[PDB]
Amino acid sequence: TNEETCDDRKEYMNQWSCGDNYELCKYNGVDVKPTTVRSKLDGNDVTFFNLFEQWNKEIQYQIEQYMTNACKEKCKCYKLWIEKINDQWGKQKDNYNKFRSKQIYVSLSNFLFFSCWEEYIQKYFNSKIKNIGSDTF
């Protein structure tokens, strides 16, 4: 219904799609070829996780334009992207847990905290060495 009348609005453009072995996520019309070089981290498995990393980044970047998001069509498209992002985040969490299971020998909480502070340390600094702010903390 509103999917066709809302895609042409070229406002959301959720490029990433996660779609069975690992629930591969595809950024755009580019095929995924795992270049294996190799029950801990090994082979193409880590590469999959690496892909998820970029997804994570754009997810935060997503919020950016959604902070620029603000009648009936707008609300319907808003709920539509909310559902899309919810299911995509659920699938990414599930395949991350599968990665952790294959990487038994970082818990989606400490690692995400480190990434969201890496955003800060990279936007201005490089600088991941000193903590002498005492006011920005």
């Binding site: 270049t35 981290l41 880590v46 590469t47 754009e58 690692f111 905290f113 920005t136 903390f137």
Partner: protein, 577 residues
């Protein structure tokens, strides 16, 4: 004027004083706050916040009652809750520092306007000068008082601004003051110059204007003497990134993105135009020769600075000289665009410059497009202006040559050049050039290091990471504006002059050749073996796959150790004879 503002300030001060925060302005505030807390926490049990939220409505009603009754006793019409804000001010900016900074800036703007008016009145009779025409009695003393006032406001504003920026990193104080109070759009935070030359060469900084009258004329290359560093501004940088902000917002629905300011453009010397414009505020339509002299000065200075700073960066005299010629060509193109006002940046400099140009060229009712046409033909007219600026740039580059004791490059040596491409295309091609150079440097360094290239690989990957969003941005912008014959085009620029349905085709066919200064300014081959960089954007390419495992392993190790560092740091951040 400014009454309900004072009421809001006082109410905020009472609200934040009644409960213990960073307030010590009085002879003591801690005593009163401690007594209030001791009184409150005996019957109520925190409870202070609940009590304040309970009584805030009554206090606001009380102040409304007070204003209503005081205007009732007044013989004029009895007022009502019509004062600014029927509700107490919101909590978005209830910080004491923010409010104090805002009021300080507002009063500084008002007094600066007052001093400007006083100078204009007392120095209106350079012109009508009585003499070395430095002795005036009232004018000199007034601008000296302004000088001392600015001297103290320098350190005051420095301290307040650094505190605010540290507290709210990610914003800018100058823009906040500009938007909150439109009373000072002419304000240019240059008044608080740090260079000693701007204090001694400029006797009054921003006001080396009418209080000082010299009428110094620009000295061409034929003149052996120069401006003796009249506007010797700071040198530009070479390792700073692009900017996504400072783009005009046509509307919230569109919110066009993907446009970024090139590093070279955002490091531009344009300091000297503001004081000379302030000096020549009087004398409309007859000081354009002074404007021409000033723009020749600034063009020569920026060309000399660019050649002095960029030429040593690289021992490849040939291609470095060609790249410098292309860079100064692009600088001239941007200067021509801002002369005609065909740019997208809207900072405090460009906004003021375009306002002044519009009020100068536009007599009484000329349309915006009419003013664009008038300034374009004036720039193209000969007395051409874009031959005088070309000769000034040649003079500056020749000064750089004789200072460096080198030869005159073949590039830019032509006395005439053609009409340039739209600035978006130039920004895109120079972005591709710098990306290619950085990739060639980083990949070569990583290959040379490897066993130890883990740091080099980290540098390469953290340089590559920001480029994906950049690529997506201008690709998406190009896909929405390409091939439009100025009828349905997004702007007034005559698009559809590039035969390329896709950006990859044009970047492949555009500058896959000589890096000389004529049109084609790239030199990049053996990269695809031109289109494989997309597969290098994401970490699946064959070339990176050789070191991918080692790079991701060392990256994860660094992630773990830095996680430990940050968590232990945040735990530690709890606190005669």
């Amino acid at each position: 004027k400014g009454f309900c503002h004072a009421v809001q300030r006082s109410f905020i001060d009472y609200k934040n004083m009644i409960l213990g925060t960073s307030v010590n302005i009085y002879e003591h505030i801690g005593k009163l706050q401690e007594d209030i807390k001791k009184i409150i926490e005996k019957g109520t049990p925190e409870n202070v916040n609940a009590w304040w939220k309970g009584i805030e409505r009554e206090m606001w009603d009380a102040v409304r009652c007070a204003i209503t009754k005081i205007n009732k006793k007044n013989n004029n019409s009895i007022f009502n809750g019509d004062e600014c804000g029927v509700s107490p001010p919101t909590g978005n900016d209830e910080d004491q520092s923010v409010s104090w900074f805002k009021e300080w800036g507002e009063q500084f703007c008002i007094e600066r306007l007052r001093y400007e008016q006083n100078i204009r009145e007392a120095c209106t009779i350079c012109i009508n000068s009585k003499s070395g025409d430095k002795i005036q009695g009232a004018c000199k003393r007034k601008c000296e008082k302004y000088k001392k006032y600015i001297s103290e406001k320098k350190q005051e504003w420095d301290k307040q601004k650094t505190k605010y920026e540290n507290k709210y990193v990610g914003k800018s104080a100058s823009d906040l003051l500009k938007e909150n109070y439109p009373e000072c759009i002419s304000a240019n935070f240059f008044i608080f110059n740090d260079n000693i030359e701007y204090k001694t060469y400029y006797p009054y900084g921003d006001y080396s204007s009418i209080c000082s009258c010299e009428q110094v004329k620009y000295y061409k290359y034929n003149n052996a003497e120069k401006k003796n560093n009249k506007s010797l501004c700071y040198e530009k940088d070479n390792d700073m990134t692009w900017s996504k902000k400072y783009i005009k917002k046509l509307e919230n629905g569109r919110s066009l993105e993907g446009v970024y300011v090139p590093p070279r453009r955002q490091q531009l010397c344009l300091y000297e135009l503001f004081p000379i414009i302030i000096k020549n505020e009087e004398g409309m339509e007859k000081a354009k020769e002074e404007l021409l002299e000033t723009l020749q000065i600034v063009a020569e200075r920026e060309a000399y600075y660019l050649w002095k700073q960029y030429n040593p960066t690289g021992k490849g005299i040939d291609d470095a000289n060609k790249k410098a010629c292309c860079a100064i060509r692009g600088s001239f193109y941007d200067l021509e665009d801002i002369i005609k006002g065909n740019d997208l940046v809207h900072d405090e400099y460009t906004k003021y410059i375009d306002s002044k140009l519009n009020e100068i060229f536009g007599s009484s009712n000329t349309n915006d497009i009419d003013t664009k046409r008038a300034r374009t033909d004036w720039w193209e007219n000969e007395t051409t202006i874009r031959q005088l600026v070309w000769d000034a740039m040649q003079s500056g580059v020749r000064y750089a040559v004789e200072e460096k004791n080198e030869n005159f490059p073949l590039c830019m040596g032509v006395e005439h050049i053609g009409i340039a491409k739209p600035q978006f295309i130039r920004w895109l091609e120079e972005w591709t050039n710098e990306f290619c150079e950085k990739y060639t440097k980083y990949f070569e360094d990583m290959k040379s290091k490897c066993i130890e290239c883990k740091k080099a690989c980290a540098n390469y990957t953290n340089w590559l990471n920001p480029k994906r969003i950049e690529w997506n941005g201008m690709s998406n912008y190009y896909n929405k504006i390409y091939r439009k014959s100025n009828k349905e085009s997004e702007d007034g620029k005559d698009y559809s002059m590039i035969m390329a349905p896709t950006v990859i085709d044009y970047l492949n066919k555009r500058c896959h050749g000589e890096i000389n200064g004529n049109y084609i300014c790239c030199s990049c081959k053996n990269i695809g073996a031109l289109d494989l960089m997309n597969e290098v954007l994401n970490k699946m390419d064959k070339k990176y796959s050789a070191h991918k495992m080692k790079c991701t392993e060392v990256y994860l190790e660094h992630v773990e150790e830095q996680l430990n560092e940050i968590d232990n740091a945040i735990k530690d951040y709890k606190l005669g004879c």
